[PDB]
């Protein structure tokens, strides 16, 4: 079958890991500061 030459290859390639910047937990995200803040007089 001498006709138009074309190659079909589906692209589903996974991207490389992004490694985005990491959020920093608040001081009130730790159990001990939470206890100190809630137990305030």
């Amino acid at each position: 079958r001498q006709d138009y030459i074309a190659k079909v290859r589906y692209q589903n390639d996974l991207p490389a890991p992004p490694c985005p910047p990491k959020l920093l937990k608040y001081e009130i995200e730790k159990e001990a500061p939470q206890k100190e803040f809630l137990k305030d007089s």
């Binding site: 992004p18 985005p20 959020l23 937990k25």
Partner: protein, 39 residues
């Protein structure tokens, strides 16, 4: 201490959601009924 303080905004599975998530539950059901249950 770094690991404890580190927080990642989006999860490993949720990274494809980002700011706009979409549902393919119907797609999953159709795949189950037409691939795993394919005759």
């Amino acid at each position: 201490e770094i690991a404890s303080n580190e927080r990642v905004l989006i999860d490993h599975n949720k990274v494809l959601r980002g700011l706009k998530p979409k549902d393919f539950s119907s797609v999953a059901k159709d795949c189950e009924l037409r691939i795993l249950k394919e005759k």
